[PDB]
Amino acid sequence: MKRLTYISKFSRPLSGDEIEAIGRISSQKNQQANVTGVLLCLDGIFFQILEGEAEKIDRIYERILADERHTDILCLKSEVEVQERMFPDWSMQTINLDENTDFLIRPIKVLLQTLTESHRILEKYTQPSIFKIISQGTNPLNIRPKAVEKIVFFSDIVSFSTFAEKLPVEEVVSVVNSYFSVCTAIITRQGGEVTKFIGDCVMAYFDGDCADQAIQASLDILMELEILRNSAPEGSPLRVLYSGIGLAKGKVIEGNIGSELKRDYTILGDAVNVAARLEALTRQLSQALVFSSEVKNSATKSWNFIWLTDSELKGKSESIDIYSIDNEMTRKSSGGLEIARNIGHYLERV
Amino acid sequence: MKRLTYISKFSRPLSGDEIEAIGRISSQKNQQANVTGVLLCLDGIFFQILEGEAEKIDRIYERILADERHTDILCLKSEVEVQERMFPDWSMQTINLDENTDFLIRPIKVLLQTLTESHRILEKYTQPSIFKIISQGTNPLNIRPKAVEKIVFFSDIVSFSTFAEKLPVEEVVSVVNSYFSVCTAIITRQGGEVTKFIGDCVMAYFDGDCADQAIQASLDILMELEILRNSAPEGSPLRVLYSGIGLAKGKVIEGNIGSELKRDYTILGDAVNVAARLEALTRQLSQALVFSSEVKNSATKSWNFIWLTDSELKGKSESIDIYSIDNEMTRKSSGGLEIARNIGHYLERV
Numbered sequence: 258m259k260r261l262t263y264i265s266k267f268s269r270p271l272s273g274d275e276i277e278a279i280g281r282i283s284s285q286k287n288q289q290a291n292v293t294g295v296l297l298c299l300d301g302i303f304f305q306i307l308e309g310e311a312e313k314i315d316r317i318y319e320r321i322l323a324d325e326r327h328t329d330i331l332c333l334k335s336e337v338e339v340q341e342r343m344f345p346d347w348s349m350q351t352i353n354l355d356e357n358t359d360f361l362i363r364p365i366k367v368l369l370q371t372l373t374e375s376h377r378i379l380e381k382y383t384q385p386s387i388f389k390i391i392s393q394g395t396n397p398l399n400i401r402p403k404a405v406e407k408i409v410f411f412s413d414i415v416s417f418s419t420f421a422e423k424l425p426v427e428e429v430v431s432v433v434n435s436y437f438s439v440c441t442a443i444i445t446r447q448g449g450e451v452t453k454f455i456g457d458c459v460m461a462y463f464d465g466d467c468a469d470q471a472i473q474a475s476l477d478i479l480m481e482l483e484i485l486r487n488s489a490p491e492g493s494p495l496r497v498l499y500s501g502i503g504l505a506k507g508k509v510i511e512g513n514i515g516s517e518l519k520r521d522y523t524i525l526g527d528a529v530n531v532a533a534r535l536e537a538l539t540r541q542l543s544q545a546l547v548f549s550s551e552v553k554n555s556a557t558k559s560w561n562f563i564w565l566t567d568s569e570l571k572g573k574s575e576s577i578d579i580y581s582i583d584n585e586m587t588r589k590s591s592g593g594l595e596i597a598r599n600i601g602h603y604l605e606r607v
Numbered sequence: 608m609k610r611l612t613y614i615s616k617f618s619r620p621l622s623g624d625e626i627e628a629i630g631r632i633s634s635q636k637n638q639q640a641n642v643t644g645v646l647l648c649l650d651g652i653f654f655q656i657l658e659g660e661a662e663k664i665d666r667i668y669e670r671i672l673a674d675e676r677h678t679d680i681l682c683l684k685s686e687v688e689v690q691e692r693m694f695p696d697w698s699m700q701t702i703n704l705d706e707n708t709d710f711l712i713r714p715i716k717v718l719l720q721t722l723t724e725s726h727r728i729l730e731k732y733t734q735p736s737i738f739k740i741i742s743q744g745t746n747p748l749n750i751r752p753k754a755v756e757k758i759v760f761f762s763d764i765v766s767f768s769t770f771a772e773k774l775p776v777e778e779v780v781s782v783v784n785s786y787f788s789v790c791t792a793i794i795t796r797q798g799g800e801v802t803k804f805i806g807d808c809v810m811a812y813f814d815g816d817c818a819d820q821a822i823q824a825s826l827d828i829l830m831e832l833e834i835l836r837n838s839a840p841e842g843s844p845l846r847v848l849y850s851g852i853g854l855a856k857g858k859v860i861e862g863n864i865g866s867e868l869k870r871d872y873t874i875l876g877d878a879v880n881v882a883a884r885l886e887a888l889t890r891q892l893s894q895a896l897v898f899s900s901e902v903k904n905s906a907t908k909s910w911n912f913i914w915l916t917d918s919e920l921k922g923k924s925e926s927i928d929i930y931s932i933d934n935e936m937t938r939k940s941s942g943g944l945e946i947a948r949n950i951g952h953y954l955e956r957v
């Protein structure tokens with residue numbers, strides 16, 4: 258079978274009566290499906306273990322995930338090869354530790370709480386792909402390195418040094434984090450993975466056969482930033498936030514790369530270098546979005562490709578043909594590269 | 608008072624009798640010091656909460672940290688402003704959950720275990736500075752951004768593309784991770800912080816008044832790699848592993864930078880760019896280690912500085928004077944940059 262173990266946070270307060278009530282209705286709809294498990298709660302935190310049929314389990318959990326009485330739902334463990342059940346006795350036993358006064362459950366309550374808020378902290382510092390992998394039923398640390406084709410995405414803020422020059426530290430961080438949120442949301446919805454931030458640069462990747470998603474995610478980012486600029490308060494740093502984006506494609510190594518005590522599940526390869534180099538040429542080329550020939554040809558949609566240049570770098574000494582896409586949004590975003598050359602004054606007066 | 612909460616792993620097996628025995632001797636030496644708390648164990652994992660006087664607490668914990676009957680000791684929480692005690696009743700009560708059969712502690716045992724291995728996984732993906740900050744009694748997520756002077760360290764592998772060209776993926780990752788371990792150990796012991804890996808590049812920083820530690824950590828790395836090369840098996844990829852290092856100094860922003868769901872506690876500033884640019888010139892300059900004028904002058908030891916060049920980049924259009932240090936190790940390491948231009952053949956035959 259499949260055994261899922263998750264934790265979540267109360268969206269708003271709940272009383273034992275509502276908790277127990279969710280317990281009962283849980284047990285019933287569970288008995289119907291031969292699903293077994295436990296539900297605990299401790300100071301506004303839910304713990305649950307559910308076991309049963311794969312298709313059954315995922316369907317319950319899809320409903321648990323869209324239920325608005327809890328949030329920050331995180332799968333701690335997914336076992337997909339289960340043959341045994343740990344909670345044969347309960348369709349959905351519920352244990353409210355808040356009310357518990359028992360002598361040994363007490364020291365155990367404060368451990369749980371401390372373990373949990375700690376885990377919550379680490380979650381915030383943890384790459385998204387790690388929890389994906391965990392929810393797909395694998396331990397990230399056990400994945401062997403592998404060669405894979407990827408589209409690599411690289412982006413940064415135009416004239417970011419002017420920002421950090423002129424703005425108080427809290428505004429600078431605020432601006433960068435806004436940027437990073439915009440990119441991460443759109444890249445994730447489009448099926449990609451944001452893998453690293455460095456300075457004000459985003460690095461991400463999509464599966465090798467997803468050039469169209471890479472390009473679209475990028476056009477969407479340009480669009481989102483345009484909404485954000487024209488929507489921002491008067492004098493806002495935000496009104497002159499502009500990005501350059503660079504796309505490349507290549508075979509890369511995917512896996513656990515790092516020192517002994519600290520690793521990233523990430524990629525490593527020539528395409529990472531190429532995408533970064535491409536993004537850096539967006540100033541010279543006056544194109545907010547630049548990508549390689551291979552990204553272009555690997556694309557299968559009717560994009561309005563424009564040949565930009567024949568350019569050198571690296572490497573093997575061969576010139577690489579560089580492309581963008583011509584439409585209202587890239588034109589506006591490309592014009593924004595010029596604007597961004599001279600925002601020091603504007604920024605000065607925030 | 609101060610309340611410390613940590614978890615650790617059994618270095619080797621222990622029986623309840625040894626566990627309880629550590630409990631008793633714990634309770635006694637604790638009663639002596641007005642220290643209170645709890646010790647739990649669950650399948651080869653120790654949980655402990657200790658409360659008492661700051662100087663008392665740190666002294667016990669210094670002894671706990673160097674005790675070889677457990678490992679992977681991680682402080683989950685440090686409270687330094689405590690006025691109340693949660694475990695007034697026990698100098699060191701011990702609760703072995705392994706033996707427990709109680710009806711509700713049972714579902715609680717499997718939660719603890721799952722929460723814990725999960726937390727263990729995330730630890731591996733988590734920056735070192737986060738646990739430092741936690742052990743110093745602060746929640747990393749609550750630290751406001753701040754301007755600070757830093758020496759930024761940047762390093763990478765010479766001709767790394769030849770490696771990823773010629774070597775199987777497992778060897779490539781093995782080689783990079785070896786590199787990253789060597790740098791991280793030495794940078795950490797010398798008081799610095801490795802903050803990010805990107806491709807095969809390390810980025811780190813030291814406090815602004817620690818140029819001497821920055822330089823020494825770097826010389827030590829060159830030395831460590833030399834030991835590693837000349838110590839490696841015949842034909843090993845390792846025997847042609849070489850690094851270039853770049854040091855810069857400047858005022859930077861330190862803080863939580865990232866999207867909503869994923870952040871790094873890191874730095875951001877011109878000095879980060881400058882150090883990277885400096886490291887890239889190590890090929891041109893034929894100097895394994897290059898650093899800026901400011902790093903030099905901020906240094907207070909009798910280093911054997913050699914002026915390298917007057918170089919341009921960035922930025923503000925001003926030429927920056929670039930330095931290295933002249934001794935047997937930098938000379939050997941600088942000669943290694945030439946060697947590394949032509950290791951494709953050697954690597955081919957591994």
Ligand SMILES: Cc1cc2nc3c(=O)[nH]c(=O)nc-3n(C[C@H](O)[C@H](O)[C@H](O)CO)c2cc1N(C)C
Nearest residue numbers: 279283286287303305317320321324326327349
């Ligand atoms: C902690 C918690 C546990 C839940 N467990 C279950 C569950 O085990 N089975 C189930 O069908 N539905 C559940 N639910 C919610 C149910 O999916 C929905 O109430 C109904 O099944 C939708 O018809 C749970 C909800 C919870 N809330 C408080 C966040």
Ligand SMILES: Cc1cc2nc3c(=O)[nH]c(=O)nc-3n(C[C@H](O)[C@H](O)[C@H](O)CO)c2cc1N(C)C
Nearest residue numbers: 629633636637653655667670671674676677699
């Ligand atoms: C789980 C565990 C808890 C410990 N707790 C304590 C403790 O609470 N107080 C203390 O003085 N010493 C301890 N110790 C170890 C002691 O520091 C040393 O045995 C002596 O104090 C050194 O004289 C603990 C050791 C442990 N091992 C099994 C990893």
